[PDB]
């Protein structure tokens, strides 16, 4: 029975994140409206201690975030050094909101260590851009890294899979020098597109060389081709790396209708990737991430919660607090845009061949 990390107070904190106001409530509300919480073990998150957060983040960065968080000083002159500014404003309380999210992911990971469940979910986590000493890309603390470091207490090989629209650079950086954690990111890669890293030739460094995997993808990819790429890469990675636990980041900014308007995915395509990973029967930590069409992001993660539970959901959006956000059609399904797929099969094939060459060294 999957663990679902949730409390009303936790969701209320996550609702205050500057670039996604109210999204956590919308996601939880729709999950609850489909009664999926009744088939999961609800676990209240523990807040991360300063010591928890400092296993990855530097004391100087943590101290700055704490300082500007106290009153929401979005005009502190030292914020740009620590990555705060336009993408990451110093929202009042953000230090404590981030510690709550980091603690929730750590709590998920601890549930997995203890054998409480085989799947633990923190849909309000996944803030994969944050660096040891810098906020980045709407991420202030890197809860994914914190969750992986907690799993490292028990699991000697952790596979991180990152299906967000953006490259999971903060997680890849954290583990770039180690072979205990393999990071695998599928993302849009185009000069000028954030964060600008994650070409197929980026494979990690030192003892971690070939233990980072990047799949650079162009605008317009749809469900079938995405799943083909994902299954091909993950098949090779599973055989080469033999993970004992998986952390899966499922940012919904890939989904048709997102204002970023880059990929052209539906939750069905992501759900097939998720099913492939669940079939490994490993301890699996499930995280959210990006997603800036808020109703579509709730649709996606609600559908994926159903996939985790093996449950087929009704097309009709049930009545709930945010029902009117789903109009005028009020259905769960998302329809792809009619715009071109810029991914040429020959380029995708060469990327896959390059990755297979990389993974022979593993």
């Amino acid at each position: 029975v999957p663990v679902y990390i949730y409390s009303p107070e936790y969701v209320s904190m996550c609702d205050s994140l500057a670039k996604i106001p109210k999204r956590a409530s919308m996601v939880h509300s729709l999950i609850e409206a489909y009664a999926l919480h009744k088939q999961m073990r609800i676990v209240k998150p523990k807040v991360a201690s300063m010591e928890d957060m400092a296993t990855f983040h530097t004391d100087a960065y943590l101290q700055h975030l704490q300082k500007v968080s106290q009153e929401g000083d979005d005009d502190h002159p030292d914020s740009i050094e620590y990555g705060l500014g336009y993408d990451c404003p110093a929202t009042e309380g953000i230090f404590d909101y981030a510690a709550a999210i980091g603690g929730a992911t750590i709590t998920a990971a601890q549930c997995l260590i203890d054998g409480m469940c085989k799947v633990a979910i923190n849909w309000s986590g996944g803030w994969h851009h944050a660096k040891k000493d810098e906020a980045s890309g709407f991420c202030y603390l890197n809860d994914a890294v914190l969750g992986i470091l907690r799993l490292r207490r028990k699991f000697e090989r952790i596979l991180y899979v990152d299906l967000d629209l953006h490259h999971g650079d903060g997680v890849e950086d954290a583990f770039s020098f180690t072979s205990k954690v393999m990071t695998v990111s599928l993302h849009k890669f185009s000069p000028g597109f954030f964060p600008g890293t994650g070409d197929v030739s980026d494979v990690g460094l030192g003892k971690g060389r070939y233990y980072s995997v990047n799949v650079p993808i162009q605008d317009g990819i749809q469900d079938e081709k995405y799943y083909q790429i994902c299954e091909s890469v993950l098949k090779e990675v599973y055989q080469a790396f033999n993970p004992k636990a998986v952390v899966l980041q499922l940012g919904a900014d890939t989904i048709a209708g997102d204002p970023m308007c880059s990929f052209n995915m539906t939750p069905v395509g992501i759900g097939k990737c998720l099913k492939y990973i669940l079939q490994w029967q490993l301890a699996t930590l499930i995280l959210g991430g990006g997603g800036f069409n808020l109703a579509n992001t709730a649709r996606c993660w609600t559908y994926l919660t159903g996939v985790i539970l093996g449950k087929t959901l009704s097309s009709e959006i049930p009545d709930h607090e945010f029902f009117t956000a789903y109009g005028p059609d009020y259905v769960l399904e998302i329809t792809p845009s009619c715009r071109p797929d810029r991914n040429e099969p020959h380029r995708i094939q060469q990327i896959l061949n390059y990755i297979k060459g990389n993974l022979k060294h593993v």
């Binding site: 336009y86 993408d87 851009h129 980045s136 954030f194 600008g196």
Partner: peptide, 5 residues
């Protein structure tokens, strides 16, 4: 340093 956003 890129902008996201």
């Amino acid at each position: 340093r890129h902008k996201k956003x």
